[PDB]
Design a protein around this nucleic acid. Structure first.
Ligand SMILES: [Zn+2]
Ligand SMILES: [Zn+2]
Lengths: 392, 93, 1236, 46
RNA sequence: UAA
């Protein structure tokens, strides 16, 4: 059987041939033969970061049982995508071919969050009943914390060395856990009402928490006391993330229809304040290129941004990216595949644009012309570019 | 030989550790232990974990290659009842 | 515990400038390779004569020139690392470079940057010499210059100069502006090939006049928008300012924008140009398919010569095609804007690619004739002469700078010593191995033999019976009377060399005593022989004419044309002069009175003009006077003339071996260290006067006489160009214990004026015209006596009474770069194999295997045979790959076998591994395993293949005896996933597939089956094995440590690097009982990590301990494990790594005590000595440290008392042991001198 | 509302005597051996 | 002998 494969092995061969021979990465021309000159996403910095924009709809996956997908997570090497379902199940999907079906039944309630360790040796998952499960990379549950939180776990983030990890729930507190023994270390007290998301700084000890009380707080993991508060959100603050690599920035979205990026190095200096007519629901920093992130909205409409290109509008909008509200985004660690999950019970994979493409920025994901099965020819096509978007 | 330096039998300080953990050594083709029995356990060998011979784990006495191990998704690890060795003739088709 | 050394210095020329840096008598050519700033004097015929070389501790990112008031010389702006400026001036008094000021900008750049900085900052200099700007990514660092030398610097984002500047592409200073006006090319919305259809004309261009207001504290700058252009093609990347405007070079267009700021015209270069999109001005459509696909296009803008309307601009793409661009403007308006490709009839530029810099050597007030120096990333840097720049053009090659291009592969094999017998006698460099590297990137791509020693051509070999020294006499310009002596038996033979060295048996020569010295005398009319206790004068026919009896036995005797100098055991000097009328007199010469009351260890008669200033009526830059030079027991070099009156001169500072020496009157603790000195001319075509000092410890010190101010000798201490051959304080006594080291000068070896140093390990001093003198190991056998032979030859006698005549091989040899380099042209006029890579040596068959890589146009095919939809056939295509294997016989360096791999195939790894073909009998065979990866697009499934080749002896084809071997493929297999690496573990080979590594074994019946299996995170970049321990590099997640087992085949994950980096190469740094790994980064960092299971926070060794980080000055292409030579002291190993800039490095592991001593010495040197560009060597390598042997080499170059003081910092005996381990590091590569 | 033991390899399930595989109900238990090995490997030189 |  012949199918659409996205492997970065040959681009890495070309890139390392160029680097070992002192040859520069030649400019790609708008022609198909120049796709061989497109380097892996990790090789592009500066003005070449525009190449690492996921804009071409590549595949559409779905489980046998159409279940709500609260969270998706790539494996730390990007080999597989872990798709948590509302039925507390883990479905893996190979990045090479977007093909797998066998389930796992991870939890008993809806898995609300997953997070792999920076060392790539440990995955923690939380569910709707407050239980926290610690998983080996082969998905062998090794440790349960039955009552980590009274309410449903909302977000969990590992420390820089993965010795600790912070969790948040519908309760108004965050608690730091010692991973080695699975014992709770301290409670981050504050955050009236409800805390919705948390994140650990990639390099140093710093905790950012988003809460229903219109607040984003910065915590000291060593002491457990809030060190600064952000008052710039006029309603409950949804998912917040620092950055994958450096952490100099911090982004938080709120359901008041505003996304804000703060410079943590300059007293939470506001950098970007972008507002949308529709509600943002989740965000995802680019794993390789700083200043680049994607916002997912309630009407679909993936919105890719760039701090250095535009501080007011997205550099690229995919308006009909999903048929319903997008719940989770997940960039591949290699950076060549972007996975999105929505309430339409579908996983949609996005790859980088091709040098020439007749259907580029004209897919049913860009024009609302989704007729019956519009992805049958975009998911069963062995090649990528395809003749000029529709399907039987 | 400068082209192929003899790096096989090198005295390493962690070699006893490699014997204790992973049951490993620096001689891949070392003779099998005449006293060790996989089912009896490590106590069957008088020399203990620090034996120059090979102490084969019971995981490698299994007959059929674990299909989940080949995908890197074996939940049983060394306790699996199927072979965790890339043996081609022992694969289940 | 490691030390880093540079086996080879960089050869790729990255920058070049023409200026008055060290002198104003002529325009010099400043050449930067990676960290060495070379000053050249370009002759009228294009030859480059090196004036002096300076080595810096950082990567020279950029260079620039700024004038200084009250001086004709110009200061130098040196850019190193990331965002650092050091202002350099040349001190004429000290003949060195002193740093005016340091300017650090990396901290401010990081402070003002949201994203990571670019690795390389870019420097731009105002043509008005009012300011310089350094920018990294939209952050501009301005360095104002006062018209107290440098005003305070201001750093700001590009958005502060102009509101719209968001993604800077290029910045340049515009010309013909009364204020420092800059031009910014930027794309507010980033656009690439896949973004063009939804984003039209994104590039913008703004012209800003800067009003810099320097103040005491800070600098205030205000920019006024002179002009702004909004709609420009997306592919514009380079601004090339001209007299009336600026040429904007793009991948597909050449836009001309005047200083007024209107896009007057543009030229479409290929089919990919923005056809029917600009549509607003003159559109010059060209079907030339010119492609400027590089980030920055190299070019030279030659101003109009006063105006003759001869302002010329020359672009140059990556394929080394020179393009002429004419701007026939009559004023503001432009007429006849076009690009013309310069015709190259003789394809002299074929061997070169990726030009880096262009500099005009000689102006001659006319742009019609131009001498251009161009540095290339792959070929030799060239000095070209362009004759008639027309829209009959002729281009000729004047000279070239040797460039080993990008060393993309490194291996050890036998280039010499294949045959154990040369002309009857054993091979002089027998059982000697050499580093062989792959050089070049395109049509010009070769094998570079990095010879550990000079291989001399033998044209005569004979066996003697018993001698200790020989002399060859040339009477009528021909070889006669080769006198031999035997010190042990007190004998002297004549051996007339006219006819097969037959015994002459004629003449009354003293046959019955040891001859100390014998040479022609009296203008070749007399023969003088100095015996143990007697001095004899003969004539051409060996008839005795004069005899002198010496009470004490003579030791040192030197002869000039009218004079002879004799020293006896009593320590007093005896100088005799031949009578001019009829010779046969040998009158005495009156010595100075003060001479007889002081001890002299050695003496010689010397001809030089160094002390002409102090002589009466001789202050002329000519007329080398005769000087009687003597070395005193206090290591003082004194000399005087024949008419000396009573005045004795002296080289000041030579007793302590100071950096600078000068002549002065000698006015008057016996510690004899200086053994022999001589002052003579060294070089190939232009001869430079050098003072060479031989110490009793075997170390050789070289001083360069300044051509101007000739009474002073200077030694470059920053440059680590002179190899270490011995140690002062009797350390390394075995280097001089067996055979006494004598320095012999030969003005004509093969046109080279060289110095021969005898001993158990001989040395030769060769100086190329474009390089400093270098100490080269000569052969691999001891040298006892060397004498001139015929013309341009010498005869050398080893320790086993074997005499053979030598000649310097100069056909493809470059005797510079710290080690002799041999260029091996594999591609000939018939078969033009492209860039060669993955070179291996088959030890059993003694053959070299290399893989060629032809760049063919790439056709994107789907999984089915049908082509991918968006294909255009009448358009230039991107280059694919096509590779094969070449079997090369080192006997003739000819390809004796070739096999070709299909389209879209690159051999990503080749090894000459020893494979166990039987687990029971343990039989091993050396197979060649090639890993072929199908270089294709991301959309197609990855595929690859691995081939196992056995070299088999076959019947040679008649005519060619070296074609007695062929490649037999014992196994091949096409596998899913690219094969990026190949490695052998414990007799079995492991290859990498897509996110997978498979270990296979070969049986006797040539059956290959996988036995092991391990998953890979992203992509395998390199893989090495140490017995049964693997290290697998990853393109994103550092590397991991794997142990391999057999019976129950296992791939045990022993550990992995805690930090995720894109590793380039891997190697093992064993360092005794422990185990360390060397990992080169894509950021030019080499990391040392250790397997420490016993450390607390290692998770039983699963977390590799990060020991040190070391920023190399160029990206590493390859690493190899080499046995380490131990001069004094379980096998030990070292790492040898090839760099893209053409440099070879090595990491030598050290023990704890050696590391402590060398770390203390290095820290002392850094803290106390003055660094060249003000760069701290510790901080430059940190962008327990790895020790830089370049810094430790400065310890060897310090003064004697300074050396003792530095060594005293930690260790009573630290001087002795420090010299011992410095010798051990310096000679660590001499394991190649002893093998099999 | 009641789950099935899909990916659980029948050895980390004990009969409770909320999730069932074939008839009789079971419950998932942590593999308190891999976690212990992780603890053992966290020890110094072990 | 399986999840
Ligand atoms: Zn045993
Ligand atoms: Zn298993």
């Amino acid at each position: 059987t012949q199918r659409r494969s996205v492997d970065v092995s040959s681009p890495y061969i070309n890139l390392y041939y160029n680097r070992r021979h002192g040859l520069p990465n030649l400019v790609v021309e708008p022609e198909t033969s120049y796709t061989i000159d497109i380097m892996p996403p990790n090789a592009y910095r500066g003005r070449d970061r525009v190449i690492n924009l996921p804009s071409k709809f590549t595949h559409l996956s779905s489980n046998k049982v159409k279940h709500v997908i609260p969270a998706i997570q790539w494996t730390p090497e990007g080999r597989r995508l872990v798709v948590a379902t509302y039925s507390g199940e883990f479905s893996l999907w190979n990045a090479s071919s977007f093909t797998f079906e066998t389930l796992m039944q991870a939890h008993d309630s809806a898995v609300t969050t997953m997070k792999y360790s920076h060392d790539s040796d440990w995955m923690i998952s939380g569910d709707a009943d407050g239980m926290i499960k610690i998983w080996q990379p082969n998905f062998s549950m090794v440790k349960e914390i039955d009552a980590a939180h009274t309410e449903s776990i909302r977000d969990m983030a590992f420390s820089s060395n993965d010795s600790k990890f912070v969790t948040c729930s519908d309760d108004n507190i965050l608690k730091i856990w010692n991973f080695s023994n699975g014992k709770q270390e301290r409670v981050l007290s504050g955050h009236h009402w409800d805390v919705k998301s948390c994140d650990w700084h990639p390099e140093m000890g710093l905790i950012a928490s988003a809460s229903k009380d219109n607040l984003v707080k910065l915590w000291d993991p060593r002491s457990g006391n809030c060190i600064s508060s952000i008052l710039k959100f006029k309603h409950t603050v949804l998912k917040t993330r620092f950055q994958p690599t450096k952490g100099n920035l911090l982004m938080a979205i709120s359901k008041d229809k505003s996304c804000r990026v703060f410079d943590i190095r300059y007293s939470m200096k506001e950098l970007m304040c972008v507002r949308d007519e529709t509600d943002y629901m989740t965000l995802e920093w680019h794993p390789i290129n700083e200043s680049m992130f994607t916002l997912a909205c309630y009407d679909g409409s993936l919105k890719h941004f760039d701090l250095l290109q535009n501080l007011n509008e997205p550099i690229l909008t995919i308006p009909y990216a999903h048929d319903k509200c997008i719940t989770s985004l997940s960039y591949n660690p290699v950076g060549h595949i972007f996975a999105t999950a929505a309430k339409d019970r579908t996983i949609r994979f996005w790859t980088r644009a091709r040098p020439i493409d007749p259907n580029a920025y004209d897919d049913p994901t860009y024009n609302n012309k989704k007729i019956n099965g519009w992805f049958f020819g975009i998911n069963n096509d062995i090649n990528a570019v395809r003749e000029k978007g529709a399907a039987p | 030989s400068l082209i192929h330096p003899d790096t096989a039998k090198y005295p390493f300080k962690f070699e006893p550790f490699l014997r204790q953990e992973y049951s490993f050594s620096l001689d891949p083709d070392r003779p099998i232990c005449e006293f060790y029995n996989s089912r009896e356990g490590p106590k069957s060998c008088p020399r203990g974990p620090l034996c120059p011979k090979k102490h084969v784990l019971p995981i490698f006495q299994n007959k059929i290659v674990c299909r989940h191990w080949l995908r890197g998704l074996c939940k049983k690890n060394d306790q699996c009842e199927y072979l965790h060795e890339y043996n081609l003739r022992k694969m289940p088709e | 515990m490691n030390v880093y050394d540079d086996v080879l210095d960089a050869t790729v020329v990255s920058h070049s400038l023409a200026t008055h840096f060290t002198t104003s008598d002529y325009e010099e050519l400043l050449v930067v390779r990676t960290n060495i700033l070379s000053v050249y004097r370009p002759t009228r015929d294009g030859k480059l004569y090196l004036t002096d070389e300076f080595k810096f501790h950082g990567l020279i990112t950029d260079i620039g020139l700024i004038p200084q008031k009250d001086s004709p010389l110009s200061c130098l702006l040196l850019c190193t690392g990331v965002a650092k400026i050091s202002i350099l001036k040349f001190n004429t008094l000290t003949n060195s470079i002193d740093t005016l000021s340091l300017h650090y900008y990396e901290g401010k750049f990081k402070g003002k940057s949201l994203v990571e900085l670019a690795k390389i900052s870019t420097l731009r200099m105002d043509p008005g010499s009012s300011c310089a700007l350094l920018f990294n990514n939209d952050i501009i660092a301005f360095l104002p210059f006062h018209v107290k030398f440098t005003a305070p610097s201001v750093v700001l984002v590009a958005s502060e100069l102009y509101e719209g500047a968001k993604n800077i592409i290029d910045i340049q200073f515009l010309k013909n502006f009364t204020k420092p006006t800059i031009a910014l090319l930027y794309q507010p919305k980033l656009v690439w090939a896949g973004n063009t259809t939804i984003s039209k004309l994104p590039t913008q261009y703004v012209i800003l006049t800067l009003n810099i207001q320097p103040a005491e504290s800070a600098t205030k700058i205000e920019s006024t928008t002179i002009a702004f252009v909004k709609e420009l093609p997306w592919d514009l990347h380079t601004i090339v300012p001209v007299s009336n405007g600026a040429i904007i070079v793009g991948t597909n267009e050449l836009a001309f924008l005047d200083n007024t700021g209107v896009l007057q015209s543009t030229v479409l270069l290929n089919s990919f140009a923005d056809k029917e999109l600009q549509k607003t001005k003159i559109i010059n459509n060209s079907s030339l398919e010119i492609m400027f696909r590089e980030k920055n296009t190299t070019s030279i803008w030659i101003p109009s010569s006063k105006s003759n309307n001869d302002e010329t601009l020359l672009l140059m793409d990556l394929k080394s095609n020179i393009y002429y661009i004419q701007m026939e403007a009559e004023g503001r308006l432009l007429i006849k804007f076009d690009i013309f490709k310069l015709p190259i009839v003789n394809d002299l530029l074929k061997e070169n690619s990726n030009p880096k810099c262009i500099t005009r050597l000689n102006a001659t007030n006319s742009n019609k004739n131009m001498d251009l120096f161009i540095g290339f990333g792959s070929g030799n840097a060239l000095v070209l002469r362009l004759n008639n720049l027309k829209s009959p053009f002729d281009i000729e090659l004047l000279s070239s700078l040797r460039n080993v291009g990008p060393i993309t592969s490194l291996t050890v094999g036998k280039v010499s010593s294949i045959d154990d017998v040369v002309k009857g006698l054993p091979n002089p460099n027998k059982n000697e191995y050499s580093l062989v590297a792959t050089s070049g990137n395109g049509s010009g791509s070769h094998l570079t033999v990095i010879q550990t020693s000079v291989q001399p051509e033998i044209e005569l070999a004979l066996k003697f019976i018993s001698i200790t020294q020989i002399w060859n006499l040339k009477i009528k310009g021909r070889d006669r009377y080769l006198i031999t002596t035997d010190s042990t038996k007190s004998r002297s033979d004549i051996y007339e060399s006219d006819n097969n060295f037959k015994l002459h048996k004629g003449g009354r020569l003293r046959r019955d005593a040891t001859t100390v010295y014998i040479s022609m005398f009296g203008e070749e009319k007399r023969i003088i022989q100095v015996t143990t206790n007697h001095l004899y004068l003969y004539d051409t026919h060996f008839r005795r004419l004069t005899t002198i009896k010496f009470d004490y036995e003579v030791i040192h005797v030197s002869v000039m044309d009218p004079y002879i100098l004799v020293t006896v055991s009593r320590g007093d000097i005896k100088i005799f002069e031949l009578e001019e009328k009829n010779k046969r007199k040998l009158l005495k010469v009156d010595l100075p009175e003060i001479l007889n009351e002081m001890v002299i260890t050695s003496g010689l008669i010397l001809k030089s003009n160094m002390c002409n200033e102090f002589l009466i009526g001789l202050s002329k830059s000519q007329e080398e006077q005769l000087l009687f030079t003597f070395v005193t027991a206090d290591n003082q070099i004194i000399f005087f003339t024949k008419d000396h009156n009573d005045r004795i001169f002296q080289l000041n500072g030579v007793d302590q071996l100071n950096e600078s020496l000068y002549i002065s009157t000698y006015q008057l603790v016996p510690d004899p260290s200086i053994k022999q000195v001589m002052i003579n001319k060294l070089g190939h075509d232009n001869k430079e006067e050098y003072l060479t000092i031989l110490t009793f410890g075997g170390e050789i010190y070289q001083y360069r006489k300044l051509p101007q101010r000739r009474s002073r000798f200077y030694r470059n201490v920053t440059r680590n160009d002179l190899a270490i051959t011995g140690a002062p304080d009797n350390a390394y006594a075995k280097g001089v214990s067996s055979i006494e080291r004598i320095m012999h000068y030969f003005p004509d070896y093969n046109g080279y004026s060289v110095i021969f140093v005898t001993g158990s390990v001989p040395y030769i001093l060769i100086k190329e015209d474009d390089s400093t003198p270098k100490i080269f190991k000569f052969g691999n056998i001891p040298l006892v006596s060397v004498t001139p032979w015929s013309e341009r030859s010498v005869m050398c006698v080893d320790d086993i009474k074997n005499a053979r005549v030598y000649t310097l091989t100069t056909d493809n040899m470059y005797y510079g770069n710290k080690l002799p380099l041999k260029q091996i042209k594999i591609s000939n006029v018939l078969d033009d194999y492209k860039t060669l890579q993955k070179l291996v040596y088959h030890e059993r068959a003694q053959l070299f295997l290399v893989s060629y890589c032809k760049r063919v146009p790439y056709e994107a095919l789907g999984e089915d045979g049908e082509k991918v939809i968006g294909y255009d056939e009448n358009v230039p295509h991107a280059e694919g790959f096509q590779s094969g294997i070449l079997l090369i016989n080192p006997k003739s360096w000819k390809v004796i076998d070739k096999i070709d791999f299909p389209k879209n195939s690159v051999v990503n790894e080749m090894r000459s591994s020893m494979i166990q073909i039987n687990s029971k009998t343990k039989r091993k065979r050396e197979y060649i395993i090639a890993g072929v990866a199908n270089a294709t697009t991301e959309d197609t499934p990855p595929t690859g293949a691995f081939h196992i080749y056995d070299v088999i002896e076959v019947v040679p084809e008649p005519g060619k005896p070296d074609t007695n071997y062929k490649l037999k493929e014992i196994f091949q297999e096409e596998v899913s996933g690219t094969v990026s690496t190949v490695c052998e573990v414990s007799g079995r080979f492991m290859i990498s597939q897509s996110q997978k590594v498979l270990v296979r074994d070969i049986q006797e019946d040539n059956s290959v089956i996988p036995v092991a299996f391990l998953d890979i995170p992203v992509f395998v970049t390199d893989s090495k094995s140490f017995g049964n321990l693997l290290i697998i590099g990853d393109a994103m997640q550092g590397f991991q440590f794997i142990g391999f087992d057999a019976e129950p085949y296992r791939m045990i994950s022993l550990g992995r690097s805690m930090s995720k980096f894109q590793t380039m190469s891997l190697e093992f740094l064993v360092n005794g009982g422990d185990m360390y790994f060397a990992a080169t980064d894509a950021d030019r960092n080499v990391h040392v990590l250790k397997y420490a299971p016993d450390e607390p926070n290692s998770l039983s060794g699963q977390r590799l301990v990060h020991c040190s980080s070391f920023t190399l000055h160029s990206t590493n292409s390859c690493m190899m494990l080499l046995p380490r030579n131990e001069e004094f002291g379980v096998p030990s190993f070292q790492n040898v790594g090839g760099q893209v800039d053409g440099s070879v490095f090595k990491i030598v592991p050290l023990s704890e005590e050696k590391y402590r001593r060398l770390y203390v010495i290095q820290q002392q040197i850094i803290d106390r000595e003055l660094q060249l560009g003000g760069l701290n060597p510790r901080m430059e390598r940190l962008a327990r440290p790895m020790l830089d042997f370049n810094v430790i080499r400065r310890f060897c170059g310090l003064a004697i008392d300074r050396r003792k003081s530095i060594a005293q910092k930690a260790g009573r005996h630290a001087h002795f042991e420090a010299w011992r381990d410095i010798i051990n590091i310096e000679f660590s590569m001499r394991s190649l001198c002893q093998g099999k | 509302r009641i789950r099935r033991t899909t990916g659980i390899p029948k050895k980390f399930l004990k009969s409770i005597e909320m999730i069932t595989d074939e008839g009789k109900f079971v419950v998932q238990v942590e593999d308190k051996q891999s976690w212990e090995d992780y603890q053992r490997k966290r020890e110094n030189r072990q």
